[PDB]
Every structure is written in structure tokens, then in C-alpha cells.
Write a protein that binds this ligand. Sequence first.
Ligand SMILES: NS(=O)(=O)c1ccc([N+](=O)[O-])cc1
Ligand SMILES: NS(=O)(=O)c1ccc([N+](=O)[O-])cc1
Ligand SMILES: OC[C@H]1O[C@@H](O)[C@H](O)[C@@H](O)[C@@H]1O
Ligand SMILES: OC[C@H]1O[C@@H](O)[C@H](O)[C@@H](O)[C@@H]1O
Ligand SMILES: OC[C@H]1O[C@H](O)[C@H](O)[C@@H](O)[C@@H]1O
Ligand SMILES: [Zn+2]
Length: 257
Amino acid sequence: HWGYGKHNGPEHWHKDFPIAKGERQSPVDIDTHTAKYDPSLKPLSVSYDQATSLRILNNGHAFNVEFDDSQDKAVLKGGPLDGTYRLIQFHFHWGSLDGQGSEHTVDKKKYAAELHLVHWNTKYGDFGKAVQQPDGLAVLGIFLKVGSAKPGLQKVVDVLDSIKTKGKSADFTNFDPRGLLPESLDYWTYPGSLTTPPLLECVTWIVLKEPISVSSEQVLKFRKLNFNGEGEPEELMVDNWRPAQPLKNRQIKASFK
Ligand SMILES: NS(=O)(=O)c1ccc([N+](=O)[O-])cc1
Ligand SMILES: NS(=O)(=O)c1ccc([N+](=O)[O-])cc1
Ligand SMILES: OC[C@H]1O[C@@H](O)[C@H](O)[C@@H](O)[C@@H]1O
Ligand SMILES: OC[C@H]1O[C@@H](O)[C@H](O)[C@@H](O)[C@@H]1O
Ligand SMILES: OC[C@H]1O[C@H](O)[C@H](O)[C@@H](O)[C@@H]1O
Ligand SMILES: [Zn+2]
């Protein structure tokens, strides 16, 4: 099955997921000089005050913090988006060392990690239908750099010892994702794809310009997770990022002048 190793990583995915070589793949490098302010973007609204987190799962690729998406409890609207997008899960991608780990890059610079808050367009009723639509998903991406600790991340860090291996989950109620945001909502946006198989071209990407700072200790705990299942030889969950893909016939727009 697909993964991040030499034998099953990003360079192999196209053999089972031919869209890997598609016209709208993610992530991309964000060339900040070529990105253009877009006056047509509406104000972005991140409305997470009624979010209901449920569970945290090690899926063998990353860990997902899952939300109740049976109503509009935690939604993303505005910006480039037409309609309401409901938060379903968040997860991260990270490196074996602080100099890599992000999926998007900024003028080719790699951050230590990247947070993805995944949302689906409610006009399609369910996530599965949304991933049959060009505008089915919106992913809010946030870079992580290593410096001061992020207080709102610590609850995530501290539960990871209970989901070390693939297939393990734990209750994760009453987590507030607002504690993972930076101060500014300035962003870049472009049309792209899921960054893991099935690589579907359904995503409006919204990538915040301001990184969050996390401590070395916090990211080191991410790197203690395992790709493998319980009882199997240990494969540390590190370098679970896809590199930048060709921009092709796209432009990256900025929310800021
Ligand atoms: N195309 S893939 O990345 O899903 C994939 C890579 C390798 C193997 N393999 O070695 O069996 C299977 C599937
Ligand atoms: N990494 S990502 O945010 O583009 C992503 C989100 C969701 C899924 N998914 O549901 O399969 C895959 C990848
Ligand atoms: O408990 C985490 C969060 O859950 C939300 O549903 C509440 O409205 C927030 O006030 C709270 O911070
Ligand atoms: O034809 C001019 C237009 O070219 C497009 O590629 C740009 O996205 C627009 O901002 C510009 O007004
Ligand atoms: O908010 C997420 C989680 O944080 C801590 O682990 C709390 O002990 C737990 O009750 C909660 O579910
Ligand atoms: Zn992701």
C-alpha cells in the first residue's frame, strides 16, 4: 500500500493513482513575488466557536483529530469560497528534522510541519459526494516553525503516547481548534488536490502566511509516533509529506495587498 518510504512513497503513487500526474496537484511552491493580490476575495471567516471534537486516530500515515460534522458546528466561509464548508478533521505533516516537513513551500523554503484543517462543501451533503466535485473541499493550511511552544497544541501532543501505532484511537472531546491558529488570517489561495492518495482534484487551498510557533519538544513527540501497527517492527512516523508538484495552468492569489 502507499506510504512515504523509498518503495511506496510519492514517486510510486502514480502507478495506482494516475491523477498523481494531473493538472491540479498539491502541494505547490508558493512564489510570493508572483502571487497577486485579488480584490475579488471576500473576507475569510473561520467560525470554530461551536466545534465538537470527538476522537484522535493514528491511521498509519498521520493522526487525525475528528469532528462532529453532522451540523454546521465549525465552518469556513468567505475568501475564495462559495458557500459553507464544514470542518471534518485536522492532521499534520512533519519531518524527521526541523528543516523539512511542510508540504507547501514558500519561495522554496520548507517549514518543520504543516497543519491541514479539512472541510467539505455542505451543498454536496456528505464528504464522499464532495470528493466527486471540483469545489468539494477546502483545506486551511498552517505552517509550523520551531521556537516557542504553542499552548493550544499541548493537549494533542500529550495524547500521542496513547495512539502510538496504526489503528489506535482515543477519545478527544472538548478540544478547541482555535488554539492552533496564528494571529493573522492573511493567506494565499489556489485550486489543487488532496496531498495523499487518492489525490483527488477537489480542493480549494487556503494557506496562511503567518506560521505558528511550536516547541522542539512538541514536534519531537510527533516524531515518536509509528507508521506500523502494534507488535510490528518500529517505523517512526516522520517525513510524511509530499513534495511540491508542478503548478501547471494555475495562479496563486493573495488576500493581502
Ligand atoms: N502506487 S502505490 O504507491 O500505491 C504502491 C507502491 C508500492 C506497492 N508495493 O510495493 O506493493 C504497492 C502500491
Ligand atoms: N493532506 S490533505 O489535507 O490534502 C487530505 C485531506 C483528506 C484526505 N482524505 O480524506 O483522504 C486526504 C488528504
Ligand atoms: O471544549 C472545546 C470547545 O468546544 C466548543 O464546542 C465550545 O463552544 C468552546 O467554548 C470550547 O472551547
Ligand atoms: O487578462 C488580465 C488578467 O490576467 C489573469 O491571468 C489575472 O489573474 C488577472 O488578475 C488579470 O486581470
Ligand atoms: O481536549 C482533548 C483532550 O485533552 C486532554 O487529553 C483531556 O484530558 C481530555 O479529556 C480531552 O478529551
Ligand atoms: Zn494533509
